[PDB]
Structure formats: C-alpha cells, structure tokens
Amino acid sequence: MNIFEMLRIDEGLRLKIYKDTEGYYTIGIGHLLTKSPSLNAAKSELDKAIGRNTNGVITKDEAEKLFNQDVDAAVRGILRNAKLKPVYDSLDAVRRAALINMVFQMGETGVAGFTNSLRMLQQKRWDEAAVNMAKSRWYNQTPNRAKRVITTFRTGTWDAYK
Ligand SMILES: [Cl-]
Ligand SMILES: [Cl-]
C-alpha cells in the first residue's frame, strides 16, 4: 500500500462530474472543481484543467493525471507550511501518508487547525491524538473515512486499509 492506493480507496474514481459529500462539483479521484453551485462554472473549470472541451466527461488517464498533480501539490503544500512541515518531518512513512490524506481532503488550512492533535502527533502520543482528532466536524461528517485515517495514525500500519 501507498498514498495513491490509499487515496484511491478513500475517494473512488468517477469519470463524470459529480457532487462530493459537501455537494460540490468534483470529478475523477476526488478532484474538486469548484465550490460554486453552477454546473457551468464546473464544466468551465474542468475544461481549463484538462485543456480541452470535455463536456463534463474525462478519461481514466486524464483522471489519473489530475490525481498525480493533486498528490504532488498536497506534499508540496505540507512542506511549505510552517505548521505542518515539522509534524510531517517527525513522522514515520505510514503516518506521513495519513497526513497527506487529510491535506488532500481538507486543505492545508483545515488541517493546520488541528493544532492540538498535531502537537500530540509530534510528541508521538498516538492514542491521545486519535481521541482528540475524533472530536471534529471532519469525523462527524465522514466518519468511516476519518476512522481509517485515524487508525492509521494510531497504529502506524495500513491495517484499516486491508
Ligand atoms: Cl488543476
Ligand atoms: Cl466517510
């Protein structure tokens, strides 16, 4: 297992524009197009992302390409974030993947607001961080996924993904 497989499990793969769990227009493997309510806006952002007139539909290949870019950006975002980088640097390889997952889902910003958890992770207080992370909107809204990511931080293994 790795970050790509892990996220492919959490996000799925859809080749037509769809609404995510928050009702926002997405496509592919969790690639958010726009927070706007307008499908047109969504189609527009999509064509601009792919570089062609898609008409709201993309191929597997195109989805994977967006995916690679998005994972790369998430990593790079962490590494540029003063609150995140240090946490990330302190972790083992499995747990780093958990941290990338969260950033991919919620943005650097949303993640950086888990201040207290982050510190606990940094201190390697696994059980504690897990409990603190569960008291979040994130957990309450997407509980099954959050559970998987949390277990990953708690154990440092991929068991939740097996
Ligand atoms: Cl893009
Ligand atoms: Cl979920």
Swiss-Prot record:
**Which residues hold substrate?**
32, 104, 117, 132
- List its EC numbers: 3.2.1.17
Which keywords describe this protein according to UniProt?
A: Antimicrobial, Bacteriolytic enzyme, Cytolysis, Glycosidase, Host cell lysis by virus, Host cytoplasm, Hydrolase, Viral release from host cell
Task: Give me the reactions it catalyses.
Answer: Hydrolysis of (1->4)-beta-linkages between N-acetylmuramic acid and N-acetyl-D-glucosamine residues in a peptidoglycan and between N-acetyl-D-glucosamine residues in chitodextrins
The impact of changing residue 20 to E/Q is: Loss of 99% of enzymatic activity
- Consequence of changing residue 26 to E: Complete loss of activity at neutral pH; covalently bound substrate
Q: What is the effect of changing residue 132 to I?
A: 5-fold decrease in enzymatic activity
GO BP terms: namely: cell wall macromolecule catabolic process; defense response to bacterium; peptidoglycan catabolic process; viral release from host cell by cytolysis
Tell me the enzyme class: hydrolase
Give the consequence of mutating residue 11 to Q: Complete loss of activity
Give GO cellular component annotations, separated by semicolons.
host cell cytoplasm
Q: How does activity depend on pH?
A: Optimum pH is 7.3.
Q: What up-regulates or down-regulates this gene?
A: Expressed late in the viral replication.
Q: Does the keyword Hydrolase apply?
A: yes
The entry's stated outcome for residue 117 to I is:
500-fold decrease in enzymatic activity
Result after altering residue 20 to C:
Nearly no effet on specific enzymatic activity
Reported impact of residue 132 to M/F: 2-fold decrease in enzymatic activity
- GO MF terms held by the record: lysozyme activity
- Please give the function described in this protein's UniProt entry: Endolysin with lysozyme activity that degrades host peptidoglycans and participates with the holin and spanin proteins in the sequential events which lead to the programmed host cell lysis releasing the mature viral particles. Once the holin has permeabilized the host cell membrane, the endolysin can reach the periplasm and break down the peptidoglycan layer.
Question: Which protein family is named in the record?
Answer: Belongs to the glycosyl hydrolase 24 family.
**Name assigned to this protein:** Endolysin
Organism annotation: Enterobacteria phage T4 (Bacteriophage T4)
